mmCIF file of C-alpha atoms and ligand atoms in Angstrom:
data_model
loop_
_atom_site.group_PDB
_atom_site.id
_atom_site.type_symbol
_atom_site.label_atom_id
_atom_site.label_comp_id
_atom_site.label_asym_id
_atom_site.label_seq_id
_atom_site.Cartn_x
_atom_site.Cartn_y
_atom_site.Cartn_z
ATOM 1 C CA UNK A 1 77.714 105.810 59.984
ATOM 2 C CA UNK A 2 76.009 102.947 58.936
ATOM 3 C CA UNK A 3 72.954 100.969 59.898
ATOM 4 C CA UNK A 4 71.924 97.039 59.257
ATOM 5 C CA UNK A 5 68.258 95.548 60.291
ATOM 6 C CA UNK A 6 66.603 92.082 59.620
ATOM 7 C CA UNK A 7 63.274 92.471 57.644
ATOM 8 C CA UNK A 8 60.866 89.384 58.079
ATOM 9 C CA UNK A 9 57.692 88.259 55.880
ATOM 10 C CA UNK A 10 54.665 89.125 58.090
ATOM 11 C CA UNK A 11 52.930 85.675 57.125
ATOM 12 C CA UNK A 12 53.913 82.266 54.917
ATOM 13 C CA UNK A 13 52.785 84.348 51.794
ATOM 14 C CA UNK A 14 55.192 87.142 52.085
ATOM 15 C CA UNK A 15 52.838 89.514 51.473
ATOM 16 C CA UNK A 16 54.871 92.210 53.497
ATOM 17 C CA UNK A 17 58.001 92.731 55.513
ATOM 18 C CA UNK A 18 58.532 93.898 58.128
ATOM 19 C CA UNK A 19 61.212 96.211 59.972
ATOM 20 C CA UNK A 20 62.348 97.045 63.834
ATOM 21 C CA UNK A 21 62.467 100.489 64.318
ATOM 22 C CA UNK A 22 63.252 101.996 67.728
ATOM 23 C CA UNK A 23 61.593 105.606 68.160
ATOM 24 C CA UNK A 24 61.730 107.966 71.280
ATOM 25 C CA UNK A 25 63.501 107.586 74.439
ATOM 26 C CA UNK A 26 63.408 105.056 75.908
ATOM 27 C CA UNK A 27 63.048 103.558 73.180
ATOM 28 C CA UNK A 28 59.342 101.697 71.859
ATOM 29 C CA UNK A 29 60.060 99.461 69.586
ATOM 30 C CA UNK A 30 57.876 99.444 66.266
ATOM 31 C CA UNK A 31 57.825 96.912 63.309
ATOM 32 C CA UNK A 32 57.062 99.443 60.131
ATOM 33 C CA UNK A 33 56.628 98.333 56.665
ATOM 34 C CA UNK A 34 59.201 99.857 54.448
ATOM 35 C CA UNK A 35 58.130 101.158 51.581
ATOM 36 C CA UNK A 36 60.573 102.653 49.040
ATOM 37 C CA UNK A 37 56.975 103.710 46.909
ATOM 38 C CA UNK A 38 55.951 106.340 49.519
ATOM 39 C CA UNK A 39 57.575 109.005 51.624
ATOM 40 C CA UNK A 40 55.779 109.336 55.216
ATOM 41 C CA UNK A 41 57.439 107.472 58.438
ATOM 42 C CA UNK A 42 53.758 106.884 60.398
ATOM 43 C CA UNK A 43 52.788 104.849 62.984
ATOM 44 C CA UNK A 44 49.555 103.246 65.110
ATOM 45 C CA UNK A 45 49.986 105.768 68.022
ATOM 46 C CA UNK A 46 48.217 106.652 71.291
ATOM 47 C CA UNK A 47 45.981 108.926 69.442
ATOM 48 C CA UNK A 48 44.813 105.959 67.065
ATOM 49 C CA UNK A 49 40.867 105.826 67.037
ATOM 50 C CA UNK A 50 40.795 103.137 69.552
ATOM 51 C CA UNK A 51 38.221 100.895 67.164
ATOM 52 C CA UNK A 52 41.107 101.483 64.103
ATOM 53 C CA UNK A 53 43.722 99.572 66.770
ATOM 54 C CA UNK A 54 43.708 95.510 66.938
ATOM 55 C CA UNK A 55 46.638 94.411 67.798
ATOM 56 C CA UNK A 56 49.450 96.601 66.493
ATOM 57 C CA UNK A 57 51.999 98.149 69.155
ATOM 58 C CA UNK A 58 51.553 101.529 69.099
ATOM 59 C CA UNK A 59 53.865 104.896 69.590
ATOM 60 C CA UNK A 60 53.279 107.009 72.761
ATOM 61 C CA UNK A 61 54.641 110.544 72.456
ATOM 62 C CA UNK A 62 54.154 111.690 75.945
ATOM 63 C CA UNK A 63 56.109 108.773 77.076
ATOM 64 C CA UNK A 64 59.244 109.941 75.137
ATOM 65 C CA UNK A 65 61.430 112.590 76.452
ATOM 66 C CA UNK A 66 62.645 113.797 73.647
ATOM 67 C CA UNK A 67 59.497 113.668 71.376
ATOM 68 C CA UNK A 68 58.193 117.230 70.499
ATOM 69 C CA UNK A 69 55.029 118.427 68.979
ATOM 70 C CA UNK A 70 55.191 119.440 65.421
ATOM 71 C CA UNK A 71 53.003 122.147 65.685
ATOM 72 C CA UNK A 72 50.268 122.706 63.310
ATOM 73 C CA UNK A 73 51.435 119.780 60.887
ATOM 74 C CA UNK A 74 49.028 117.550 59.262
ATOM 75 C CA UNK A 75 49.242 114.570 57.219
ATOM 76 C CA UNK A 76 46.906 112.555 55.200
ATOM 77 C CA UNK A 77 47.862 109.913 52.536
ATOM 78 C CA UNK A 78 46.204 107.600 50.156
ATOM 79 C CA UNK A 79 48.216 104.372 48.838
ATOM 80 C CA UNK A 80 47.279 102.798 45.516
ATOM 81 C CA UNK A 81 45.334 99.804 46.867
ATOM 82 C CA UNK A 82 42.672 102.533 47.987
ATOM 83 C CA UNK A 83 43.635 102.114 51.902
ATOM 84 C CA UNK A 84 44.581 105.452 53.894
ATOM 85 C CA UNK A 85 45.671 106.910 57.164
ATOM 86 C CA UNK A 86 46.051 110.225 58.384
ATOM 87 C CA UNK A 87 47.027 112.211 61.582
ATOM 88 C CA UNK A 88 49.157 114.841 63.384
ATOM 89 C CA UNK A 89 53.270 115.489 63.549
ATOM 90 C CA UNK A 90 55.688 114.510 66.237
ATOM 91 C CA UNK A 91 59.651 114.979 65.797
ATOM 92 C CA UNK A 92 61.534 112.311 67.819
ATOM 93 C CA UNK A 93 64.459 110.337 67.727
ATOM 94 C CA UNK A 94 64.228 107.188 65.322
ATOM 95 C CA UNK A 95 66.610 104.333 64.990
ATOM 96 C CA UNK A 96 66.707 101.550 62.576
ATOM 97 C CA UNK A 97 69.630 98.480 62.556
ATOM 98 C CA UNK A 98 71.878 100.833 64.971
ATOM 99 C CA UNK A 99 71.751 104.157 62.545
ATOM 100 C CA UNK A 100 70.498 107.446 64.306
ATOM 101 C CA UNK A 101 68.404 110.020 63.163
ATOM 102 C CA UNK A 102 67.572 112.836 65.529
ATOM 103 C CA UNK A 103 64.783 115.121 65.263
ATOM 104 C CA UNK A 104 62.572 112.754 62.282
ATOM 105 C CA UNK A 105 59.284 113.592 61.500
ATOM 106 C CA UNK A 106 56.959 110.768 63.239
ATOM 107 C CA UNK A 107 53.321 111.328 61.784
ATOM 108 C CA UNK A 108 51.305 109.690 64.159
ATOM 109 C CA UNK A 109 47.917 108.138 63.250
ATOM 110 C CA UNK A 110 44.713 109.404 64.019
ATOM 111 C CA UNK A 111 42.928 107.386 61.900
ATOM 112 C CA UNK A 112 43.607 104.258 59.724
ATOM 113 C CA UNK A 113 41.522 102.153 56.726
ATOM 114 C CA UNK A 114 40.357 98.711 57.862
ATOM 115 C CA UNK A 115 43.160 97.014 55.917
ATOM 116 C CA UNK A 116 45.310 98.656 58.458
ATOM 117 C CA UNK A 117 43.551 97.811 60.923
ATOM 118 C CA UNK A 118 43.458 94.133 59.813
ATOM 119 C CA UNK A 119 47.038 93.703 59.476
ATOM 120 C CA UNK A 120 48.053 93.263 63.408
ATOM 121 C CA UNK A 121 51.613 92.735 62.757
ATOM 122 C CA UNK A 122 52.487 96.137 60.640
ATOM 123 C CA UNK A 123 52.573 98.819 62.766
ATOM 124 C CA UNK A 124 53.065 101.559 60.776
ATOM 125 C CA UNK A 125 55.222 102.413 57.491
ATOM 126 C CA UNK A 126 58.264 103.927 57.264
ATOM 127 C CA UNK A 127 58.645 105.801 53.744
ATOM 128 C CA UNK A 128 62.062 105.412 51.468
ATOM 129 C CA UNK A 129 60.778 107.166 48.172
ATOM 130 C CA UNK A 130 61.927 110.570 47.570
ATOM 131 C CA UNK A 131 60.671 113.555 49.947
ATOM 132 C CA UNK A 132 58.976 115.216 47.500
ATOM 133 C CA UNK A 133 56.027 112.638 48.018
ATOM 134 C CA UNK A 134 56.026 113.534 52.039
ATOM 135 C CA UNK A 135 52.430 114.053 52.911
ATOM 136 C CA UNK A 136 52.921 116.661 55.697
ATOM 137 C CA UNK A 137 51.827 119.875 55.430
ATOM 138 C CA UNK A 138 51.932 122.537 55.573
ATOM 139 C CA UNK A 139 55.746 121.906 55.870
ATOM 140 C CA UNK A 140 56.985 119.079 53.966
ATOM 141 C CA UNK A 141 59.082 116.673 56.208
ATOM 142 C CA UNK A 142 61.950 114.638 55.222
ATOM 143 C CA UNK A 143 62.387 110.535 54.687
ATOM 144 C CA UNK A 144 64.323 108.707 57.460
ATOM 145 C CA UNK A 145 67.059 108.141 54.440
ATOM 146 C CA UNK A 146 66.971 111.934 53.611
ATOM 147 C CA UNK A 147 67.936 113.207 57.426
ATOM 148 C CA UNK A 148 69.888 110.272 57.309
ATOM 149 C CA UNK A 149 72.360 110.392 53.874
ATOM 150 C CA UNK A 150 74.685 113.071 54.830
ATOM 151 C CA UNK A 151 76.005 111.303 57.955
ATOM 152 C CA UNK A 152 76.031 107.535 55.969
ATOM 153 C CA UNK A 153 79.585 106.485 55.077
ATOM 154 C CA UNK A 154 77.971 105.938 51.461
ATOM 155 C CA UNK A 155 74.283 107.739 50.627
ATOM 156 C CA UNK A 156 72.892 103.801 49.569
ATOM 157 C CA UNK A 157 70.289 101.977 51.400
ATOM 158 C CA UNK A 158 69.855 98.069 50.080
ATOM 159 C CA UNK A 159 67.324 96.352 49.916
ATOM 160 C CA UNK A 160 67.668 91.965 50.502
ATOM 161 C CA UNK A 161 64.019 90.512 50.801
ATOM 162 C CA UNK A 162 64.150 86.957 51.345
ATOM 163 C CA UNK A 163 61.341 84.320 49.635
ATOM 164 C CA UNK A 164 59.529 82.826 52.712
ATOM 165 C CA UNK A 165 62.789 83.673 55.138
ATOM 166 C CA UNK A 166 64.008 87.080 56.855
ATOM 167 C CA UNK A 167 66.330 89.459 55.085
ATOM 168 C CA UNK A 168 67.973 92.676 55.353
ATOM 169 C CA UNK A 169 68.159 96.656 54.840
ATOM 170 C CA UNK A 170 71.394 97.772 55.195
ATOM 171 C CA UNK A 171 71.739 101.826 55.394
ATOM 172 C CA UNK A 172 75.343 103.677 54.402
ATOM 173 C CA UNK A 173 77.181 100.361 52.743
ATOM 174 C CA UNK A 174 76.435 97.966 50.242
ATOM 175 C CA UNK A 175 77.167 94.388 51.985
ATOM 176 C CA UNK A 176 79.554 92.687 48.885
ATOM 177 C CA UNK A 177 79.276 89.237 50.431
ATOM 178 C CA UNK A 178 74.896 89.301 50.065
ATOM 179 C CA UNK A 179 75.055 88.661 46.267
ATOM 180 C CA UNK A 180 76.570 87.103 43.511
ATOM 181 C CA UNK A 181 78.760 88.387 40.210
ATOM 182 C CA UNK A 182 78.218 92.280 39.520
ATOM 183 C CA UNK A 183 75.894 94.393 40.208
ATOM 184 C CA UNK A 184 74.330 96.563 37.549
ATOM 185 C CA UNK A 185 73.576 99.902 37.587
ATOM 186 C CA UNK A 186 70.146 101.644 35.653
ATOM 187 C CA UNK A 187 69.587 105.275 35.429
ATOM 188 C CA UNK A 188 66.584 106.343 37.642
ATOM 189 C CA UNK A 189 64.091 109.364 36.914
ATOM 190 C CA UNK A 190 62.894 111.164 40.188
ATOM 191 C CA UNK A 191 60.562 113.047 38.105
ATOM 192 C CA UNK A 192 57.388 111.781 40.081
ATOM 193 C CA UNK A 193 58.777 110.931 43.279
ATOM 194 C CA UNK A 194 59.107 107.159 42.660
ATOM 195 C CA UNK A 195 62.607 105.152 42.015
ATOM 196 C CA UNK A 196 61.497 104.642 38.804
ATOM 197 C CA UNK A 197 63.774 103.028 35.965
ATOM 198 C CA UNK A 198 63.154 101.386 32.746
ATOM 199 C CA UNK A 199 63.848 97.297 32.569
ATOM 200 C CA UNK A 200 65.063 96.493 29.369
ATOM 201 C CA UNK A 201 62.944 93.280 28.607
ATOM 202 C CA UNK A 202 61.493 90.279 30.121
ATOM 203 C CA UNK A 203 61.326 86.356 29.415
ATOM 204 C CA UNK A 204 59.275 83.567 30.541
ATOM 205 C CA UNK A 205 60.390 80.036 31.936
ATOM 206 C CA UNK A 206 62.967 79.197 29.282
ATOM 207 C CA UNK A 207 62.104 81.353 26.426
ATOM 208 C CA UNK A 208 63.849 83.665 24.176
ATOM 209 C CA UNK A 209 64.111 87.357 25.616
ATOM 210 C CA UNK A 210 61.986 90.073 24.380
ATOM 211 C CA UNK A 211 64.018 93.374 24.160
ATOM 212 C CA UNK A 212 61.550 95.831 25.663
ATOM 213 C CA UNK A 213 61.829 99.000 27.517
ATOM 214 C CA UNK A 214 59.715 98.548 30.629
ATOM 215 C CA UNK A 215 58.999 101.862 32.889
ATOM 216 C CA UNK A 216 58.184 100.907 35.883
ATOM 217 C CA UNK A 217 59.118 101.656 40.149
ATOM 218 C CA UNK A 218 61.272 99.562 42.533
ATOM 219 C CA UNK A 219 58.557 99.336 45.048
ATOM 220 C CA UNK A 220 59.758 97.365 48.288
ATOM 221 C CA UNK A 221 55.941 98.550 49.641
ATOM 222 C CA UNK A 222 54.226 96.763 47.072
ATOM 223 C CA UNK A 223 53.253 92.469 47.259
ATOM 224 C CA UNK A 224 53.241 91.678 43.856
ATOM 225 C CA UNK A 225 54.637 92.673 40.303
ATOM 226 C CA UNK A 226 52.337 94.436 38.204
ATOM 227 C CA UNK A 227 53.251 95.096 34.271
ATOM 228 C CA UNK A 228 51.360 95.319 31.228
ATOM 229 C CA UNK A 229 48.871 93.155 30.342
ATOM 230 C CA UNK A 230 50.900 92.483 27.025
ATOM 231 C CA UNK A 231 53.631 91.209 29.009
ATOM 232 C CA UNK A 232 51.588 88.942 31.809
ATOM 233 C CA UNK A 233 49.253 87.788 28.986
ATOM 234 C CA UNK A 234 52.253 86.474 27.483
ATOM 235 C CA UNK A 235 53.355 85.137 31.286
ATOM 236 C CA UNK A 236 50.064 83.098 32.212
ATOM 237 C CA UNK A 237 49.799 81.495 28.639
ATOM 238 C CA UNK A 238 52.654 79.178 29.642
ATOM 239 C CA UNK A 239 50.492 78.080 32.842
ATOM 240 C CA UNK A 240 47.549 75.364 31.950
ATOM 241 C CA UNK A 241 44.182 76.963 33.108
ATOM 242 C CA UNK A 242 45.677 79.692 34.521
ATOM 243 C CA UNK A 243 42.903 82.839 33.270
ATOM 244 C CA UNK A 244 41.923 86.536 34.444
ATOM 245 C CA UNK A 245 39.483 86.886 36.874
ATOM 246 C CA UNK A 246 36.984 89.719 37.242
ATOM 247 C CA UNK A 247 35.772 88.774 40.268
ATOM 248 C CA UNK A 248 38.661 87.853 42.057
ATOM 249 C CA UNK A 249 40.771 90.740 40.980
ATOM 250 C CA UNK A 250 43.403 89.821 38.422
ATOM 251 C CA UNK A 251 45.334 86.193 37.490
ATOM 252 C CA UNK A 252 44.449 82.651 39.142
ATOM 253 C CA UNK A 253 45.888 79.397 38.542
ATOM 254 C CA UNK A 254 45.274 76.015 38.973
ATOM 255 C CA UNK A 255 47.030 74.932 42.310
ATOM 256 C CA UNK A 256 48.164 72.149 41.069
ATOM 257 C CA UNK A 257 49.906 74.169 38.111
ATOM 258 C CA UNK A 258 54.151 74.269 38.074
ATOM 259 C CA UNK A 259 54.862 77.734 37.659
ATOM 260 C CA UNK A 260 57.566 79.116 35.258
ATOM 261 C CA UNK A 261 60.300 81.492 35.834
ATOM 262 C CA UNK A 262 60.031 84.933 34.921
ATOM 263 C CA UNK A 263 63.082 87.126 33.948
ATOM 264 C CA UNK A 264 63.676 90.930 33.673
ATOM 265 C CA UNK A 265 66.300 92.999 32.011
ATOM 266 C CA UNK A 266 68.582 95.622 34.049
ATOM 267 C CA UNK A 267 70.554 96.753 31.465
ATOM 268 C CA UNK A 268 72.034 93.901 29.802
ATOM 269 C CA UNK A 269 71.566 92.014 32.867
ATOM 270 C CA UNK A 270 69.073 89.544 33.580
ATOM 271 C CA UNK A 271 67.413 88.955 37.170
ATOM 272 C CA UNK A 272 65.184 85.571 37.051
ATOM 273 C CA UNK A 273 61.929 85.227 39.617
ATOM 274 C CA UNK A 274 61.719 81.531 40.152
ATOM 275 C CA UNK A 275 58.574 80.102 39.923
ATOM 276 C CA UNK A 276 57.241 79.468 43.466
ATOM 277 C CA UNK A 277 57.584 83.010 44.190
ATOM 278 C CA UNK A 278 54.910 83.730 41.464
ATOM 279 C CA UNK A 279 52.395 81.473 44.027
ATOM 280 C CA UNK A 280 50.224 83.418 45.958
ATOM 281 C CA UNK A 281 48.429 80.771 47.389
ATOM 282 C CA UNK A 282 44.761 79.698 47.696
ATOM 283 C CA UNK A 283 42.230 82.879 47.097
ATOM 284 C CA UNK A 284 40.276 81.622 50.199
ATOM 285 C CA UNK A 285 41.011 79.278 52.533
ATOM 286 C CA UNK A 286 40.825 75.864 50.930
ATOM 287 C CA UNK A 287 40.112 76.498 47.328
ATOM 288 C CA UNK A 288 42.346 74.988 44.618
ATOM 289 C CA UNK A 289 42.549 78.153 42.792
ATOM 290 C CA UNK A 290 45.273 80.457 43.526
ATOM 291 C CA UNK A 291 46.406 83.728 43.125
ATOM 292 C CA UNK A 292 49.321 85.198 40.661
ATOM 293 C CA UNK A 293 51.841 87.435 41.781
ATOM 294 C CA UNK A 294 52.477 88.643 38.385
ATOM 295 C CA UNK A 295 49.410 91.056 37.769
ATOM 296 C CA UNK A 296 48.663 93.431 35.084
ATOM 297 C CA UNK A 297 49.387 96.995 36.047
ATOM 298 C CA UNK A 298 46.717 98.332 33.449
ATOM 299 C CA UNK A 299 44.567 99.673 35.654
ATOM 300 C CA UNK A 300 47.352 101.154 37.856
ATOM 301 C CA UNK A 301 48.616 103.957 35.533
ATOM 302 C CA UNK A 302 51.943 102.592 36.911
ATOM 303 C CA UNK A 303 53.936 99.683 36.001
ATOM 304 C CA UNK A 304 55.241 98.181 39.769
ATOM 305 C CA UNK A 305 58.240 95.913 40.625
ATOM 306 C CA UNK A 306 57.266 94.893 43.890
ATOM 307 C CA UNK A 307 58.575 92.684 46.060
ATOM 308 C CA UNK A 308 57.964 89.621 43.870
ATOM 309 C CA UNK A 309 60.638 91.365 41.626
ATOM 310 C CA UNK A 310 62.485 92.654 43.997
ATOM 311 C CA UNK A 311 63.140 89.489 46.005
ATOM 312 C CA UNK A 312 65.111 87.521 43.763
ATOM 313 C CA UNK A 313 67.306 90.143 43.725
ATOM 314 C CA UNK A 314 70.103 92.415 45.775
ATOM 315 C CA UNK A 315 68.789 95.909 45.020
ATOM 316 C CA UNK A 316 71.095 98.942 45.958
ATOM 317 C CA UNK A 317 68.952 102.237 46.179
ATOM 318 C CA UNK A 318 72.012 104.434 45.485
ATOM 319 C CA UNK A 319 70.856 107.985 46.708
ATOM 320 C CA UNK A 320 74.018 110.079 45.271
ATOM 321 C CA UNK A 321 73.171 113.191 43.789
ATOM 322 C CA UNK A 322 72.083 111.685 40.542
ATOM 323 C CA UNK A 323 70.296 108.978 42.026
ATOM 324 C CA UNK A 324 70.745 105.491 40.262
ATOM 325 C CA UNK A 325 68.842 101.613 41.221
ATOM 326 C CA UNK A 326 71.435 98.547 41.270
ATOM 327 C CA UNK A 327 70.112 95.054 40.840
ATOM 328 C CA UNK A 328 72.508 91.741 41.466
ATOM 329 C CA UNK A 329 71.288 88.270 41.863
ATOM 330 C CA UNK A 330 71.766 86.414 44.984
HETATM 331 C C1 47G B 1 47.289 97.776 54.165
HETATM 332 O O1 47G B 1 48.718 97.686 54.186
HETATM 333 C C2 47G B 1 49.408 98.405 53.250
HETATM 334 C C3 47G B 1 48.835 99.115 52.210
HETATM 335 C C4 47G B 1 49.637 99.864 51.369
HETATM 336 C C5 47G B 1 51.011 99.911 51.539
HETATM 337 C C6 47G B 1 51.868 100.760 50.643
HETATM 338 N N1 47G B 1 52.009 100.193 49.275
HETATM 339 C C7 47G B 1 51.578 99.179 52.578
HETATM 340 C C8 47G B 1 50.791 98.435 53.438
HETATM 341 O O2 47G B 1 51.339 97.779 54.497
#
């Protein structure tokens, strides 16, 4: 089997995609974030605090006939941005791009962080990072991809995120018409639950490449790219009065400011981030300073290729039993 859905920027910043999902029967239809950084399929539900809801579509169990109570599951999960949501267990049938999966764990919310709250078009997320991160307890549950992967004609999902336009996730096939030359293959350690891989240098606008082995996680859940502050110093020193912020959070530039390209190794490979993908945009509404989307990841504990990263690329998430990342431009 295979599967194949459109994934669309949830505002003129990209600062998420999102996904149709169909879950339960009849269906409901649910736009989820996909996020190949975390593990749990949730979703704004019928049992959402009703003050946590503005705006989302939400999932009603007891209007699906084949939804069943998980009984005595729990979940509860933090993300790295400090937002959280947490809830009870439903298996159903879920459906993404024409793909299948019968008896998936839904967790459905019971409560939700403000930013949740806040983002009316995200409805929920649906987890493509390895099952070993799944929240549930206390019986771990499996990612849509996991229940999926023996039934896929290939055990790959892709990854195309477009820059300001839709894109796609393809499940069981790698589409060879949605890039360009070869795509390279990087070894990937599953050690902490992430697909996590080591780049193997960067360079800035037209400058020389640095050979340097970056660890870091293809993280399709995550806005921006985030990598040590060695690295972005080096980035934001080629942009006139761009500086680090305390009290906005991280980089800013001048508006007016021409950003550079930035370019990371795979291999001996080279994927290049155009500038205008490194804009951000004002920091509030009408200011002429704007935000980087090349951050430093020193205060992560994790280095983060995020969608900025991942978006100038075609990025196979090759889930054979020695899982491996593949990155071709586009
Ligand atoms: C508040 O919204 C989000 C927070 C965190 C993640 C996961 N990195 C996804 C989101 O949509």
């Amino acid at each position: 089997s295979t599967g194949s859905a459109t994934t669309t920027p949830i505002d003129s910043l990209d600062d998420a995609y999102i996904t149709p999902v169909q879950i339960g029967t009849p269906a409901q239809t649910l736009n989820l974030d996909f996020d190949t950084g975390s593990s749990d399929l949730w979703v704004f539900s019928s049992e959402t605090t009703a003050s946590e809801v503005d705006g989302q579509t939400i999932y009603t169990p007891s209007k699906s006939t084949t939804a069943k109570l998980l009984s005595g599951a729990t979940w509860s999960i933090s993300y790295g941005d400090g937002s959280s949501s947490s809830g009870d267990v439903y298996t159903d049938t879920v459906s993404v791009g024409g793909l299948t999966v019968t008896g998936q764990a839904v967790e459905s919310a019971k409560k939700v962080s403000s930013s949740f709250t806040e983002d009316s078009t995200i409805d929920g997320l649906l987890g493509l990072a390895f099952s070993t991160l799944n929240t549930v307890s206390p019986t771990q549950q499996k990612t849509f991809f996991d229940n999926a992967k023996a039934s896929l004609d290939s055990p790959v999902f892709t990854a195309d995120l477009g820059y300001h336009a839709p894109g796609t996730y393809n499940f069981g096939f790698i589409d060879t018409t949605a890039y360009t030359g070869s795509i390279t293959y990087t070894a990937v350690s599953t050690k902490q639950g992430f697909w996590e891989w080591t780049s193997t240098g960067y360079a800035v606008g037209s400058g020389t490449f640095k050979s340097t082995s970056i660890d870091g996680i293809a993280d399709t859940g995550t806005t921006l790219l985030y990598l040590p502050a060695t690295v972005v110093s080096a980035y934001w020193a080629q942009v006139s009065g761009a500086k680090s912020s305390s009290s906005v959070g991280g980089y800013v530039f001048p508006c007016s400011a021409t950003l550079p390209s930035f370019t990371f190794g795979v291999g001996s490979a080279r994927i290049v981030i155009p500038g205008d993908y490194i804009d951000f945009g004002p920091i509030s509404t009408g200011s002429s300073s704007c935000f980087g989307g090349i951050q430093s990841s020193a205060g992560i504990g994790i280095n983060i290729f995020g969608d900025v990263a991942l978006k100038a690329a075609f990025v196979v998430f090759n889930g054979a039993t020695t899982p491996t990342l593949g990155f071709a431009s586009k």
